[PDB]
Amino acid sequence: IDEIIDNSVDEGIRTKFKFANKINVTIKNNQVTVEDNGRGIPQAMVKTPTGEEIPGPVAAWTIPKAGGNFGDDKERVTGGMNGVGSSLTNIFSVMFVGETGDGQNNIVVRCSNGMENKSWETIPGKWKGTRVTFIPDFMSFETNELSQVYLDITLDRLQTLAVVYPDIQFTFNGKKVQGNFKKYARQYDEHAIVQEQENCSIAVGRSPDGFRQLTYVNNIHTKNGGHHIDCVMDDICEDLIPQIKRKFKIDVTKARVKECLTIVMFVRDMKNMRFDSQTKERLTSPFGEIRSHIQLDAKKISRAILNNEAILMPIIEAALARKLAAEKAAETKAAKKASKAKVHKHIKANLCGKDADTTLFLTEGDSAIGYLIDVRDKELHGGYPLRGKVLNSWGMSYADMLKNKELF
Amino acid sequence: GRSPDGFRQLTYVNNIHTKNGGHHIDCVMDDICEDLIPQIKRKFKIDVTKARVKECLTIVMFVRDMKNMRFDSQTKERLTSPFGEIRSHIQLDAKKISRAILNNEAILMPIIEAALARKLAAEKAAETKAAKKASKAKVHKHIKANLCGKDAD
Amino acid sequence: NKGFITWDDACGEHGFGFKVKFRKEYSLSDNEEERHAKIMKDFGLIERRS
Ligand SMILES: Nc1ncnc2c1ncn2[C@@H]1O[C@H](COP(=O)(O)OP(=O)(O)NP(=O)(O)O)[C@@H](O)[C@H]1O
């Protein structure tokens, strides 16, 4: 589905937001109807190296290595580099119909039985757009029907791409979606710091159970990212990690610094994009072109998440959980200082240990032990005072009776 | 091995090294951790997360002669083989590795010592105290006349 | 704490002297039947013993 969706988006972006601005998506019960009001593929003749004369939309939809995206890399803003995409969509579909009106004619291509049947026809009409309605091949994929988790994926992707491009209005099954970076940042975390430019929009949030990201190069969901997030995160961290080192004198490592963020980065209007696969999941463009194109102030993001203790102080308290927790002193602010085993206050008789009829007086204060020293028998009667006020006895653990001084 | 200062790894798919990773290594940490993490939790009563114990180790694995290996990279740095073929061919019994790294104390002991500060820690109680560091308290325990601020005597 | 009304401490020599300032969300009733009944239901002037 994403091939036809990005074909409609590329038709939108090749005319600078003036056609294909209304893309309607309808995927219910194994049938997909996706339309836009673009120019579409025109009626102009595109030649084949074999010599046969095949018209425009049918060569775009059935034969691979065909497209208008094979131009110069210094001018192209679209993400397409293959020519094989709508053929890849059409090959794995058991039913397909596709209409492209160019303002003078409709070109309708019907395909079936896995490129055993394909037929293009030209109808007179006044339409100007593209609509693809296909029922996919379930004998090739490991499925039989369509489930709602894919529709949740499609709805969230349309939400995301509407946040990327607000000029193009997308409707999923007749339901409109608006796109704002603030609501998309605040669906993520309530304290996600936003930073927007004329070509960039980056929000920084939190990732408590690992690391999270969702970055976009132009109109492709780069789930593996690319060189752009590497350069931007190096530019943020090269101001952030010395700032937290000046802040709380903890040299947090770069993985440990960047491991507690979720990043919402949407980049628009870039040139000379390079991805290393037909999967297109990660950018292998050189960093000089990306650094020349990006004019995002990453130091603004560094100062805007440095003062934000909703993100940074979890990293610093995890550092406290591994370094200040290692800074062990083990007190409770009761009296502090040295943890003495036995204090010097002690009265010991000579029968300290043997079996006799001796006694110990647990009397109160130095007065009563002064009178007791002036009174007692040295062999028979002992004594010990108490240092002061003792609290409730059974509110405290047996190791905390061991922590108490006079009880020890 | 051991890794006290970040994440390190070593993977070879047949003759080809992936310095970035793959999907057989996710199966290797999955089959190791599913036998390891409940055993450590029953051993020392600690709950350390999978990333926090994943960043503390290095794993060096050598894999030889497996079929239909798949690479999305021109440097072949990510094994994009399916989990069915990986779990079918890799017959590495990870419970013996889990009980072998359970018997090695060279990794878990300083982390458990750090955990011992909180987990299975001796109680202290006594006078905890509190630094509330005063308050404003303007309207509480004071007399307010109606000329509070005006020019008067 | 409902926000209905506020008070200030100006207690005099004989009896009490507390000054009560009305806010805007309340009944603010009239006719001197229901406002007085709302006062003795709210300020608790009527007290019963045994
Ligand atoms: N529905 C369509 N709308 C517009 N252009 C289309 C459509 N179907 C096919 N095309 C054209 O044919 C190509 C489709 O094959 P595809 O592999 O997507 O080529 P690409 O866009 O050059 N590469 P990529 O998008 O990275 O896969 C596009 O480049 C378009 O020029």
UniProtKB/Swiss-Prot annotation, chain C:
Part of the DNA topoisomerase complex made of gp39, gp52 and gp60. Belongs to the type II topoisomerase family. The chain holds residues 253 to 302 of 442 of the full protein. Disulfide bonds: none annotated. The gene is 52. Medium subunit of the DNA topoisomerase that untwists superhelical DNA. Controls topological states of double-stranded DNA by transient breakage and subsequent rejoining of DNA strands. It comes from the Viruses. Transmembrane segments: none annotated. This is DNA topoisomerase medium subunit.
